[PDB]
């Protein structure tokens, strides 16, 4: 349980940093990696 | 340009510089990592290149990579980096394409270093992915015997979920490494 | 790695013959076994590399009381395979009992072929559910294969018997077979008879000769499912890496398939993605929601357009599934095969886990229970009688399929932390 | 011509249905990737895809409305235009100034499209009782369609037909610049985009129509699940709409045969010098 | 958006076949479904985009006791549509009762087609009033469609049965159908049998084969009514935006149509506007006054001339209507279709709301009341009997149509602030 919490905690922090790092290229990763919008619905 | 691409076949070098060195073929690579599983999981302080070359030969003759020219195939060989007392084979490993032509002017050493860096990055991720596929196979095999052990069904189900979280992330990143990269 | 195919049942042997003929035509192979004159691509999974480069198909045909095998025998394609892998009642328990007594020599043939192969990955099964002789014996062989080889994969291609009625005892047989398929198989590819029949009556104007066309359909589907292995790319060139994404949980291992051209004899990938998400391109029949969707594309593709297509189809929300978690669509790419004339060269496939087939299973669960309740439809078959004098195995399978439907409906809910 | 004079409509009615949930949000709450993707959606879903140049069609916001020409808190709905970029040898004729003129035209036309598609949506709510609001709805919708028709078949089509003849008779590139500037000057000049007051009566007319649509739809959705909730606000909107109509005709008769604009716009002779002044 | 067509009644299926044939000829479509070799224009409303770009017509044919459907069956144009949308007494109550018992499967077909369509806008109805089998069942289906889909549009094309007599019970049937059309339809396109018959006897010299010509007439009218959607401009490329102007009030939703050439196989728009305002170009029969008039032009038009024409015709006052309010004429423009030879390429259509049809309805109100008063013409039909033993539904429809005529005559007055 605590492992699951820990992992899900860090990956959201990766994505929210990923949104504004580079304008176009790195931004395209966020659409593929957040398809279901299950992220930002966790926070 | 005419004499460079026929007498020395400059373009074949690029075609084999993606397929092999930049891990552009992967029939070759999955069998290569499969044969290099028990050797590279063992700590690499006792690793010497002569054990790598001989199994490399079997792997290249068996797979699709066999069908290209023996020259560029000969210019492909392994190399290692320096050792540590914490070293394991997946940490220290390299493919090194050695140049025997005058093509070095178009394939300068700085871009060879670039090749090396992108290869290392694409080596670690392909190792961990196969670890994850191993986990999924272990899930798919062991669990049909643990139907007669009822009490583990909680935790065993819960593991099933977390795998699906990784399987997603490791199958989308590896599609971003497929396309646009 | 190296995969051996097993084929049993009349329709299963039909589609196996059609599949091998399709791959011989697809690759540079003559129907004698000889490599073609104009033959790069891998044939090192299903074709043994023989003495004159004879790509001898790695296939084991299992049959009893042969009829269609004689028609296989007199063929120019009877010299491509058969290095003597051919070995000569419509009840489940009948085929079970008959397979019981001759389990040893057919297992010896399997071990012979395993010794003949250098590596091994899986046994892919050509099956017909409630096909009479195929039923029971196929379940028996599936149980034996899971027992003897706990390190290999089992894939099952089979059709589900529904023709809107016929046989009053076939729901019992298919229920026992489904119980065996749930427990003794690793991944199941499900097909529906009435759905493929309806599509055949749709795009064409046939009513009787559906078998001859459905062979082509399943052959195209199965070859498409294996093309990235047969034509080497580098994404999921192993079976296990492909199957790992498709199975989200060991209780749901049934896969829905489509085919983007209903007939292919210059649209872009954006259009045919929209087409594939329409259910008329889907060939297998509250809200029913996918858990995980994958697609495979083979054609003349521009690599930027697939990204922007994924953007636009994502924004359009034509993916009418609500999961319980993070699972999403996955894209894959394959090569268009040479030597085959194709107009509108873009062709795609889908592999998705969808809950709707539960309802189809529920239809059988309704039917069998109905015929169980009236009790005038078991008919007192003797094979069924000494195999089980109390017929509690049917109750056992009913228990399992009830658990299966409950697992389905728990997966429909937005949490799977609760079970069913 | 294909997009700015809006020669395809399938484009727009594909778009606006499938953009509206993002368009209705306030300014700085909108985000570029959804609008860019859905613009491509509307384009490829629309039939006109065979044109060579569709890849300079962009989207930009100007929240500082016709005031800038010698809304403010909502965008996507209004304060809307297209960014259009030009290639370098094509930049010699069409440039920044032309681009600004194109946006200043298209925004004003976009408003007239939008109020019409609002009134169509309030119509379907009910396809004895009170029927005067039904007449108000019909009068407003017919009037705004007449405004659009008047602009389409007075300005855009005939002067485009003229412009297609001017470059046929061209002789040098100092003439084609003259044709372009004269065409653009006429298109601004004949329309309501050139007036010393910019016809604030028109904006007030459209404002009270938006209020009418809002309050009427809210009332009907409350009704489906009293006299102040309906009748008083309806009479207020009716009075304001009539006042703006007579104000428009009065302010238009003094300006500048070419009195025919009033003859088409009110074709029955309703509400036409019914209010004597002085 | 996307519109599905329904066709029922013998003449309705005739004009549906002719309409689909006309659009297949009009667009770049072969009668197999294949796109023509020389095919820009939209076919994304009435034609499903199938696998080989097969513009399969979005049509549902409803029939019972088929006769003309067999003649549809043996045709080269039986491969354009029919993806199995065809499903197999002359009383209103008979067709009502028969449609009652099979409401479920035909509604299932409708839901199937709704699922097949991505978007939806409307169900356009091909109807024949008092056509025997079409009567009653058409009213039943209209009521069902209004019930199940409160978010969609209903358009009705139908002819009104008048041939100056024949059937003594048809005014009852048409009255019940008109009651259903008033309440359960959103907009009605009205046609007269004797008027079109008179025009056919006028421009030609036929007396019997009127059906074969009237099919062409209605097909041309309906295609003209949809041309700006089929050939994309940008004014009213939605159905709803077009219908919104035409309906001034939910009680008056009947539309009068014309056609500017009585035969078209180089006049200006000014002339044909004057022609269209003459009633000999109008094809549907105190002062009767239009409420709102619209016209649609397709041809070789100069854009300045339409303005000056509107000036001159406005000043000439050839618009003999007096409204109660501000409603006026509306102009619209459409494209001339390619691939069709047209001499005098200018062709127009009119959509106007005119009160004169009330008198026609009044004719039936007179007739039915007369046959009600003598009471020798109900004939005691049994379907009518158990459906309604007291026959008060006829009184109910008489009440409604009386209210309708009073609403008409209140609309004739220069105030509609008073009602009727």
Coordinates of N, CA, C and O in Angstrom, one line a residue, chain B residues 24-27 30-31 34 64 67 133 136-137 140 144 147 157 160-161 164 168 171-172 175 178-179, chain C residues 1 40 42 183 186 232-238 240 244 247-248 251 324 326 328-331 333 416:
Chain B
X24 N 18.2 0.3 -33.8 CA 17.2 0.5 -34.7 C 16.5 -0.8 -35.2 O 15.3 -0.8 -35.5
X25 N 17.3 -1.8 -35.2 CA 16.7 -3.2 -35.4 C 16.5 -3.7 -33.9 O 17.1 -3.2 -33.0
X26 N 15.5 -4.6 -33.7 CA 15.3 -5.1 -32.4 C 14.9 -6.6 -32.3 O 14.7 -7.1 -31.2
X27 N 14.8 -7.2 -33.5 CA 14.9 -8.7 -33.6 C 16.2 -9.1 -33.0 O 16.3 -10.0 -32.1
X30 N 16.5 -8.1 -28.9 CA 15.8 -8.9 -27.9 C 16.5 -10.2 -27.7 O 16.6 -10.6 -26.5
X31 N 16.9 -10.9 -28.8 CA 17.7 -12.1 -28.6 C 19.0 -11.8 -28.0 O 19.5 -12.7 -27.2
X34 N 18.5 -11.4 -24.4 CA 18.1 -12.6 -23.9 C 19.3 -13.5 -23.6 O 19.4 -14.1 -22.5
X64 N 18.2 -11.7 -37.9 CA 18.1 -11.0 -39.1 C 19.3 -10.2 -39.5 O 19.6 -10.0 -40.7
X67 N 21.9 -10.8 -42.5 CA 21.8 -10.7 -43.9 C 22.5 -9.5 -44.5 O 22.7 -9.5 -45.8
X133 N 8.2 -7.1 -18.0 CA 7.6 -8.2 -18.7 C 7.7 -9.5 -18.0 O 6.8 -10.3 -18.0
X136 N 5.2 -9.5 -15.3 CA 3.8 -9.8 -15.9 C 3.7 -11.3 -16.2 O 2.6 -11.9 -15.9
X137 N 4.7 -11.9 -16.7 CA 4.7 -13.3 -16.9 C 4.6 -14.1 -15.6 O 3.9 -15.1 -15.6
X140 N 1.1 -14.0 -14.6 CA 0.2 -14.8 -15.4 C 0.4 -16.3 -15.2 O -0.4 -17.1 -15.6
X144 N -2.5 -19.0 -11.2 CA -3.4 -20.1 -11.4 C -3.2 -21.2 -10.5 O -4.0 -22.2 -10.4
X147 N -4.8 -20.2 -6.6 CA -6.3 -20.3 -6.4 C -6.7 -21.2 -5.2 O -7.8 -21.0 -4.7
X157 N -4.0 -9.7 -5.6 CA -4.7 -8.8 -6.5 C -4.1 -7.4 -6.5 O -4.0 -6.9 -7.6
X160 N -1.3 -6.9 -8.8 CA -1.8 -6.9 -10.1 C -2.2 -5.5 -10.6 O -2.0 -5.2 -11.8
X161 N -2.6 -4.7 -9.7 CA -3.0 -3.3 -10.0 C -1.7 -2.5 -10.3 O -1.7 -1.8 -11.3
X164 N -0.1 -2.8 -13.6 CA -0.8 -2.1 -14.6 C -0.4 -0.6 -14.6 O -0.5 0.0 -15.7
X168 N 1.5 0.6 -18.1 CA 1.1 1.8 -18.9 C 2.3 2.8 -19.2 O 2.6 3.1 -20.3
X171 N 4.8 1.4 -21.4 CA 4.4 1.2 -22.8 C 4.1 2.5 -23.5 O 4.1 2.5 -24.7
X172 N 4.0 3.7 -22.8 CA 3.9 4.9 -23.5 C 5.2 5.6 -23.7 O 5.4 6.2 -24.8
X175 N 6.8 4.2 -26.5 CA 6.2 4.6 -27.8 C 6.7 6.0 -28.2 O 6.8 6.3 -29.4
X178 N 9.8 5.3 -29.7 CA 9.6 4.8 -31.0 C 9.4 6.0 -32.0 O 10.2 6.2 -32.9
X179 N 8.4 6.8 -31.8 CA 8.1 7.9 -32.7 C 8.5 9.2 -32.2 O 8.5 9.4 -31.0
Chain C
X1 N 9.3 -16.2 -29.0 CA 10.2 -17.2 -29.7 C 9.5 -18.1 -30.7 O 8.6 -17.6 -31.4
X40 N 15.7 -11.2 -45.0 CA 14.9 -10.0 -45.2 C 13.7 -10.0 -44.3 O 13.4 -9.0 -43.6
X42 N 11.3 -12.7 -41.5 CA 11.5 -13.8 -40.7 C 10.5 -14.9 -40.9 O 9.3 -14.6 -40.9
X183 N -9.6 -21.7 -17.0 CA -8.6 -22.1 -16.0 C -7.3 -22.6 -16.7 O -6.3 -22.4 -16.2
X186 N -4.0 -19.3 -21.2 CA -3.4 -18.1 -20.7 C -4.0 -16.9 -21.4 O -4.0 -15.8 -20.8
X232 N 9.7 -8.3 -39.4 CA 10.3 -7.8 -38.2 C 10.4 -6.3 -38.2 O 11.0 -5.7 -39.0
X233 N 9.8 -5.7 -37.1 CA 10.0 -4.3 -36.8 C 10.9 -4.3 -35.6 O 11.9 -5.0 -35.6
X234 N 10.6 -3.6 -34.5 CA 11.2 -3.8 -33.2 C 10.3 -3.5 -32.0 O 10.8 -3.6 -30.9
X235 N 9.0 -3.3 -32.2 CA 8.1 -3.2 -31.1 C 7.3 -4.5 -31.0 O 6.6 -4.8 -31.9
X236 N 7.6 -5.1 -29.8 CA 6.8 -6.3 -29.4 C 7.0 -7.4 -30.5 O 6.0 -8.0 -31.0
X237 N 8.2 -7.7 -30.8 CA 8.5 -8.8 -31.7 C 8.6 -10.2 -31.0 O 8.9 -11.2 -31.6
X238 N 8.1 -10.2 -29.7 CA 7.9 -11.4 -29.0 C 6.4 -11.4 -28.8 O 5.7 -10.4 -28.7
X240 N 5.0 -12.6 -25.9 CA 4.8 -12.3 -24.5 C 4.7 -10.8 -24.3 O 3.9 -10.3 -23.5
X244 N 1.3 -9.1 -22.8 CA 1.4 -8.5 -21.5 C 0.6 -7.2 -21.4 O 0.0 -7.0 -20.4
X247 N -3.6 -8.1 -21.5 CA -4.2 -8.8 -20.4 C -4.0 -7.8 -19.2 O -2.9 -7.6 -18.7
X248 N -5.1 -7.2 -18.7 CA -4.9 -6.3 -17.5 C -5.0 -7.0 -16.2 O -4.5 -6.5 -15.2
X251 N -8.0 -12.7 -14.9 CA -9.4 -13.1 -15.0 C -10.0 -12.6 -16.3 O -11.0 -13.2 -16.8
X324 N -11.6 2.0 -14.8 CA -11.5 2.2 -13.4 C -10.2 2.8 -13.0 O -10.0 3.2 -11.8
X326 N -5.9 3.7 -14.9 CA -5.1 4.6 -15.8 C -4.9 4.1 -17.2 O -4.1 4.6 -18.0
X328 N -5.1 3.1 -21.1 CA -5.4 3.9 -22.3 C -5.1 3.1 -23.6 O -4.8 2.0 -23.6
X329 N -5.3 3.9 -24.7 CA -5.0 3.3 -26.0 C -3.5 3.1 -26.2 O -2.7 3.9 -25.6
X330 N -3.1 2.1 -27.0 CA -1.7 1.9 -27.4 C -1.7 1.7 -28.9 O -2.5 1.0 -29.5
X331 N -0.7 2.4 -29.5 CA -0.5 2.4 -30.9 C 0.6 1.4 -31.3 O 1.5 1.1 -30.5
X333 N 2.8 -0.3 -35.1 CA 3.0 -0.2 -36.5 C 3.6 -1.5 -37.1 O 4.4 -2.1 -36.4
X416 N -11.9 -1.4 -9.1 CA -11.7 -2.8 -9.1 C -11.0 -3.2 -7.8 O -10.7 -4.4 -7.7

